[PDB]
Homo-oligomer: 213 residues x 3
Amino acid sequence: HVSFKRPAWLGDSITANNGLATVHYHDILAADWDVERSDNLGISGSTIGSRYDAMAVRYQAIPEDADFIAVFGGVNDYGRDQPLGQYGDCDMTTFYGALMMLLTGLQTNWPTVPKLFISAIHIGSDFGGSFSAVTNGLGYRQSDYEAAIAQMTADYGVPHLSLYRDAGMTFAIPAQAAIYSVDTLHPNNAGHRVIARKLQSFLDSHFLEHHHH
Amino acid sequence: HVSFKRPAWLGDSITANNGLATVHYHDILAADWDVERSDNLGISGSTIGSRYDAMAVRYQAIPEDADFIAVFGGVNDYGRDQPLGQYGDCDMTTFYGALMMLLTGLQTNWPTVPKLFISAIHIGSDFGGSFSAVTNGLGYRQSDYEAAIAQMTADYGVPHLSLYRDAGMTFAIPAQAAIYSVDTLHPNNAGHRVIARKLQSFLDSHFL
Amino acid sequence: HVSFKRPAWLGDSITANNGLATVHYHDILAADWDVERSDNLGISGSTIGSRYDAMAVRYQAIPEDADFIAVFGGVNDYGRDQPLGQYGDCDMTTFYGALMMLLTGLQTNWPTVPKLFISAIHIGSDFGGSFSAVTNGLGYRQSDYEAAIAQMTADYGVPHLSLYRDAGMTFAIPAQAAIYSVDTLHPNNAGHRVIARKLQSFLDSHFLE
Ligand SMILES: [Mg+2]
Ligand code: NA
Ligand code: NA
């Protein structure tokens, strides 16, 4: 089974300790892995791009001896109206540009460390602002950001776990939002248990070197 | 190995216990999983769309207490000329809209139940009519219906097993249609074993 | 773990025992699998298309009794400026058409045999010629060839392992090129160890038994 001793978790409120859910996916995994330490770099509301506490800069706070790096972002870039930009952009002003710098930063400074990118579940319309099941204030769909992550991660060889495509649920359906989410955006504790299971499966199927007994 | 005790199988002829192959993929997995019950909701000729016994309506025959739901459709939508439509349709007269009605109904009524969509093998041309290895009567490739499935399932978070891209075979190639199919459309018992194998390892990959 | 007793490896300089790497990915796997034989059909500088020792023709050297077939090509097609063509092409003169020929051939002749295509790691620019981290002599990105492999394999139901996407590395990043490659094109021994792992993982999630 895949486990790590010094994981680092870069993300937004779904990763941040300050959460509406008391038990996060990484708290489940850190316990199962019996980690030496688990570095939480989640900040509520954070985007990958320039708009709010850019992950494309905050990544530089990841510990030098991290043995695993996970990035869990994009839902705020969608919901808080980060311009999407275009494939080939290389500055943090756009979502595409900010992914490029994030991905270059990670591969330059932790060349041998296993990494994955996690993108969020399809959100509902009940949170507020431009957090919609349909389009954000700039008129893009969540799946446009989700596609940007898939395209950009590919160019750097970084595996991409899409909770959007494969989590088994969408918060745009009330019956599932009621069971797995706090507010059609943030997973509750049940949603986090699901995410932990999805992440472990993904790691098992993509990272053989880091199988242990 | 992942297993389920009360699976429900929503599909067409490849699922229905009424024809050319005596042993289906879901028979193989029922035996392997030692199920309590295995609900066969296959109807021959059935489309996901409005044209024939719409699965986008028939999903409602799924038992309240199913603990796994697989949907295996699309091949009739292609071969019996269901209008494809486009992304953003919400009406069952198109394949895109029908997919939306179906996936909506699944997640509403079984929010906690593991489910997956299975896409069919690339077919050959021996069955006739619009069941062609090239294009159907509307000018679409089988792969256009495949992409529709891949796109719609993604919006709903529903894992997608593409036998089309991953089965290791195509019925458009005679050497493989002769081994694994009855007629270049329907898998034979050997084809159903392959399907069962691919499903089982997909499950192992995506479920704990 | 999924293992095979008589695998055949069709590819370029990354597969060929000509190469600058002493222990290739298939050498590692042959040793894990306890093989009866392990057929190395790598030819250095080889393309899938017509230009240099076309795999779309050479695949016929694969042994009749192969119990597994991997095709590991495309990088020379990109880097040596093989015309990409378009979806639906049929000649070996284009990349799309050569892929079609290769796939028809493999599925016709080895219908019951498990098989997969492996796509190359993102290359850097220090090798030379059109082996660029940006675009080839024809204006194409490496990912255009990678997208061709994705589409074509799918039409024949052949699983595709994209090392480009999923390897955890790119040789366009110097920090990773210095560790995992000989020259930003060819993986070194540490690079082949990583490839062996990804291949083994991919085999376990797409195949039973
Ligand atoms: Mg490209
Ligand atoms: Na899926
Ligand atoms: Na090769």
